[PDB]
Design a protein around this ligand. Structure first.
Ligand SMILES: NC(=O)c1ccc[n+]([C@@H]2O[C@H](COP(=O)([O-])OP(=O)(O)OC[C@H]3O[C@@H](n4cnc5c(N)ncnc54)[C@H](O)[C@@H]3O)[C@@H](O)[C@H]2O)c1
Length: 316
């Protein structure tokens, strides 16, 4: 019953909830292996057909667990969409043509796949954007000829990296854009970029619907780089939801799915419960709507931290 959305000009249809395999790359051994197979089986059972990973996640382990889980699924390969990344690894950054040419082979080995649907540059704000335009993207175009990848993407936090690159590449070079932390209750600045991206036929994928933990009752992690004004606004709104006996994670996830110009919202999932929670929240949004009274009250509490971002990347 999960809704599928068109992905730009790719001709692909992805589920509005995407499976982010970032948390699959933890620990090691039978435990995390049977949890990876279990969650992906649940994802397929509930209608999820979009899986995103990166060799950075788990130090290439998340790619391994995802590939084993997708292999154990028994689902035809052309009936789900796989996305992996390149350029960012546990040893650092390398967006060179040589690195990204070797990476797709290393990733496909770990994923046990013959191809990935999308290969995306991972956090280009840590590299020279001119290298991305003139070297990395022309390299991935050649990989697209080999059939090992079918669509090209770029990812990162600051929205400006999308306009900079897409202004300077030949039309059609980039097929997909992956942004994060910019379409949630506290930050919806990705809306400004949608008309720009649709004008070029680029698919739009959002991520971090909970602002990487800011919109959870447990709270943000200790390493979270949000300004203290945003973290205070988010924790007060989570307590407000807690006092009223509701879950701010559900409201934040439902909000991120209200704009169908975003083809899919990737959310990290490592448990069957997490998959069913987000899929049911998406289904509940379509069948029962959204709690407008709760959203209006949470949005007012988050006004002090509205659209507040943080520094990301290097300097150019
Ligand atoms: N964060 C980055 O640096 C980055 C950059 C580029 C791409 N991405 C892609 O985007 C995907 C999503 O990123 P995120 O995981 O950081 O999003 P997020 O932090 O907003 O929320 C998801 C996280 O909270 C927990 N959670 C999941 N479902 C929940 C529920 N129903 N109730 C309560 N808690 C729940 C999980 O630990 C998960 O990691 C990643 O998996 C990755 O594939 C991430």
């Amino acid at each position: 019953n999960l809704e599928l959305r068109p992905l730009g000009s790719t001709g692909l249809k992805v589920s509005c909830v995407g499976f982010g395999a970032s948390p699959l790359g933890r620990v090691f051994g039978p435990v995390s292996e049977d949890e990876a197979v279990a969650s992906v089986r649940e994802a397929f059972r509930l209608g999820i057909n979009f899986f995103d990973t990166s060799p950075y996640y788990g130090g290439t382990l998340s790619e391994k667990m995802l590939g084993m889980a997708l292999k154990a699924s028994g689902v035809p390969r052309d009936q789900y969409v796989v996305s992996t990344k390149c350029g960012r690894y546990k040893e650092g950054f390398d967006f060179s043509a040589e690195r990204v040419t070797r990476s797709i082979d290393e990733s496909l080995e770990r994923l046990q796949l013959d191809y990935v649907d999308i290969l995306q540059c991972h956090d280009i704000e840590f590299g020279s954007l001119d290298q991305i335009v003139n070297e990395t993207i022309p390299a991935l175009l050649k990989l697209k000829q080999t059939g090992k990848i079918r669509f090209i993407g770029i990812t990162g936090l600051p929205l400006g990296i999308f306009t900079y690159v897409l202004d300077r590449v030949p039309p059609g070079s980039v097929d997909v854009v992956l942004s994060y932390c910019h379409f949630s209750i506290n930050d919806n600045t990705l809306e400004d970029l949608l008309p720009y991206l649709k004008s070029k036929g680029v698919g739009i994928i959002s991520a971090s619907p909970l602002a990487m933990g800011l919109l959870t009752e447990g709270g943000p992690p200790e390493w979270h780089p949000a300004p203290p004004e945003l973290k205070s606004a988010c924790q007060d709104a989570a307590a407000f939801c807690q006092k009223k006996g509701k879950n701010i994670s559900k409201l934040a996830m439902q909000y991120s799915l209200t704009n169908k110009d975003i083809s899919s919202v990737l959310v990290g999932m490592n448990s069957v419960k997490q998959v069913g929670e987000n899929v049911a929240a998406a289904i509940e949004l379509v069948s029962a709507g959204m709690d407008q009274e709760m959203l209006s009250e949470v949005e007012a509490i988050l006004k002090p931290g509205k659209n507040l971002t943080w520094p990301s990347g290097i300097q150019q």
